[model samples]
Each structure stands twice: as C-alpha cells, then as structure tokens.
Target: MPMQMFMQVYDEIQMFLLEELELKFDMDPNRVRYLRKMMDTTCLGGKYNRGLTVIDVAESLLSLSGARRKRVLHDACVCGWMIEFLQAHYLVEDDIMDPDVTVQCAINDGLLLKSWTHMMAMHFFADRPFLQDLLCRFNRVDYTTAVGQLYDVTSMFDFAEFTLSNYKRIVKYKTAYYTYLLPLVMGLIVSEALPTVDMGVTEELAMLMGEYFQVQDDVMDCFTPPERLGKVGTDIQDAKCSWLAVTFLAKASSAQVAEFKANYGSGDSEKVATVRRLYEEADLQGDYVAYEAAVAEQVKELIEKLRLCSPGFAASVETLWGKTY
Candidate 1:
C-alpha cells in the first residue's frame, strides 16, 4: 500500500512541479523543457524506495489499517514527495557546485531554501526543533552526500583495487554512511519517540545494507539485461572496482588476471565480452548468494531490536528494501 501510494505521488509531484515552474517563472522554453525533463528522468530513474521510506515510516506512525489512515494518507504522500523534492533539489544544486560560479550559487541556494520552506508549511512536523533539525539534516546531508559522491566517483577511477579489503575501506565511508543513512536516520528523527537512536546499530545496518546494495548492483551490472536495468553494464568500461572484479581476482589464474587488466575497460565489445565470460567462470553468482544471505541476517537482527521508531517501524526498513535488483 505504501509503495503504491508513493509511486502515485511521484507523478502528482512531477505535474505539480511542472505547473509551478510553468506559471511562477517565465523562463526560456529551452530552460523549462530541460527542467521538466530533469524532473522525470532524474527522480523517476531509480527504484525510489529510499524516498518511499520517508512516507512509509512517517505514515506508519499513523494508523496503518485504521480509519485515521485515510486522513493522513495525502499528507504522507506530500512528505514522501517532499523527500523526492529535497533530493531533486540537492541533485540540481550540487551538479552546479563548481567553484567557477560563487555568487550564482548563493542565489540558487536561497531560492532552493524558499521552495523547501514553502513546501514544509503544508505539513505537520512534531514541532519546531523537528523542522529545524530536519532542515539542518538536509543541508549537512547534501554536503556530505556531494562530498562522498565526488570522493567515490573520483576514487573509483583514481585508486587501484588490489584487494577486497581496500575496496571495503572505500565502500565504508564512500557509501554506507552516504546513501540511505539520510532516510534511516530521518525515520527516527521525525518519529514522535525517543531521540536516543542507536547510532552504532544504525551505522552497522546502513553499512551492511549499503555494501549489500552496491555488491548487488555490481553483480547485476554483469548479469542483468539492459532492458531490465535501464542501461547496459559499464562498471567494466568505466574502470570501476566492482564486485565482479574483486571476486574474479580472488580465484583468477595468471592468464585470467592478465586478460582482465587488459580488457576490463578496453571498450571493445569483444573485450568486454571476454571479461564477462571470465566473471562467469569465476562463479561469483554463487558466492554472492551466500554473501547476501549473511548480510540479510545481519540486517534482520538489527531490525528486530529496533526501538527508536514508532511501533512496527521495523517493517519500514523491510518495505524500503525487498527490491528485485
């Protein structure tokens, strides 16, 4: 139910944003077209379960299967879309964070703030600090996210992966704390409960989930169809330190290792095919199954003992995930 409502609100907000852009500002057709396209492509491109977590946990704080649910359903959708709005705002803002433009960024930041506050007015936060804290979190989250985004993208190309331990170090700060940790922490922050969230536990779970998420992504990059995943796998072409590369190296003979170094990112279709076949021979698919199950149990234990959320919030994490790919 939460997933269905969250998906519906995405379109509603897209239309809402487009109408606001069309009416509020008289910009160039090209600008408006680009913005409209950005709304659809950037926001719609992902599984979107991360943003869905905001509303699911928020509304689950309400009556899930009771009469009161109908009353708060739309509000939850708004908050969910607000989650999307903040992220879209962050993406657009960060994409232009070149030091080449300074004053222009301040103007953009102020305008983004206004848009956020105007949207915040339409909802009920637990109180003033929650609102203040939520905004502060947004600011810090965007900065840290952009930093990790740069660090990860840069280090992926800049650093060499000679061992899985090195890759683990990269994934630790580069991903775990950087992605869904925003919404995971937000789930407790906005909850009308103890602010005493389990940071150790929270970090442990996000780290586990993020590693699982990326490893799964790396696995899928080699296996999933272009139509299924929306793009062809390019981790190889991009010289990424992907799970396939790490796992293949674990058991690769000298000849296999030499071929991967030469062809992994060679961009020749035949060489890419050679690398994929090498990955297949490494039997990574089976190893990933065991790795996934191990991490799934780790997350299940953390979710079981979760206390800081409203009742039944454990399922919120469950809902956020439970993805096919």
Candidate 2:
C-alpha cells in the first residue's frame, strides 16, 4: 500500500512536470530524459511505512468525508514523499563522505544530484506557490539533516575527543532529529495550520521511534542479508560508529581493542571477517542485541504514553511494526 501510494505520487509529479510544466531544455534531450528517469527510480525507493504511519494518525484525528479523505490521502502521500526527500538529501551528502559509487542497488550521490535538480525544477515550474513552500520546507529539513550528518561523522573520527554522553548526543542529533522529527513535523504542518505547538507530542513519539529505528538499521547492517537489504557490511566498511561498534569497543580487553583498531577500517575482507569473529568471541553481538531489545521495549512504553495522551497518534505509531526488508 505504501509503495502503491508512492508510485501514484511519483506519477502525479511526472505528469505535472511533463504536461502542465512543459519544461524545455537547451542541453541534450537525452540528458533531461535520463534525469527524469533516475528521479522516478531513486526518489521512489524507500520504506514508506513512516509516512503512512502519519496518515493513520491524521485519520484518527479528523472525521473526513470521502472527498476530504481523498485529500488527506494525497497529503499523506506528499508527507511520505517528503520523508524520502529528506533521506535523499542525506544520501547525497553521505555518498560524498564515503565516496562510494553504489548505494543499495543504485548509482551514488553525484548522479542523484543531477537527476533531482531537474526533477525539482520541473516541480517548481508546475505549481509555483505549492512547490515553492514545499521546496523551502524540504530545504530546511535538508539543512537539519546535514547538521545531523556532521554530528555523526565528527563523532566517529574524533572518538577520543568526545565522551560516551557526547556520542549519544551526536546520534540523537544526527540520526533521530531528521529521521523522526522531520517526518512527524511535516505531517503536523500538513494536517494543521502552521506555527502549531501541538507538535510536541508527535516530536516525543518520533524521538523514541527514531532512536529505535537507527539502532535497528545499525543492527541490520551487520546481520541482515545483503541481497535482501541491497547493501552488505556497509557500517563496518564505512567505519561508522554504529551501536555495535561502540558497545564492542567499550567492552573490549586490551588485546581485543588492539585487534579491533588494527582492522577497524581496513579494506581487507578477511580482516573485517576476523574482526566480526572477535566481536562474537567477546559476545559483543549478543550484548548489542540485548541493548537494542531494551531500547525497543522503552520505545514501546513511549508509544503507550502517546496512546494515552493522543490515541489517534498512538494508532498511527502502532502502524510501524511488523515490517520486513
């Protein structure tokens, strides 16, 4: 259902750009055409569960007639797409940081920018008023996401300079802020008038969800099937300061610490596998799983809090569970 909704929105955007906007190009038409294609493919790729979760909440809030429901569905679709937009904004920067040529299954950051710029221009030409505001809001989210990315990158290489508390702060700011806060806030802006303080409830809910979400992603990076998820061993290869790595490092003996540091960011496949073996020998993976489960339990408790405070939003929050791939 989420994928279907995303495709419908993508089709609408395509139509708006091609028919209503009627954008012309001085450069090669093939280049323009390829950009449009890439935008359709890459921008449409993501887990839309989070965006759909927002609609479930909004539906609970307002009693909508059929037409109103349709509008809400459209709004929900927009919210979902915007979440992907926020993700793309991050990926663009991440690709540059890692200098990877491929991500998941597609081309990396550089081509994404070329494709997205054209698509965004097309949207701008189609509906100036609506697209302008949407673009501005998206840009704001992009900036915030960059701040989060910076926090993530800076915390990793400068580990000695930061305490564990600082590491947590970086994760919260970098990962949680954009992933959870941006989508929920965007949903609020869509459903209610601007300048709404009622977003505090949603923000709280998102923070918990986002924390769990990042932890899960980090866990999955190590354990999930490469083919199923598209990328394999990315966190370790990228030298990311994942929860597993952080926990392992904190618990490592002197010899274990030396082993980890020796092969931490090395490009050797065997070394990376050896490092994973050492991690298991030290029971770090088991420890990470325990920690993650505790966090998930806390997130569930927070969801219960949301349910009591805002039952509709609570319903929305409940929709994120039981997803795979």
Number of the top TM-score candidate:
2
**Candidate 1 lDDT by residue in tens digits, 2-109:** 678777766665565556667776666676676666456545666566666766666655543255455355545555555566556656654565364656644565
TM-score for predicted model 2 compared with the true structure: 0.76
Best by lDDT: 1
Each model's backbone clash number: 0, 1
Error of 1 at 6 (Å): 4.7
- How displaced is residue 173 in candidate 1, in Å? 5.0
Model 1 lDDT, full chain set: 0.65
Every candidate's lDDT: 0.65, 0.61
Instruction: Give one digit per residue, the lDDT tens place, for model 2 in 62-166.
Output: 552156566655665666655665466556655554553356324443445434544644443344334566556666756666676677766556446234455
lDDT of 2 at 181: 62
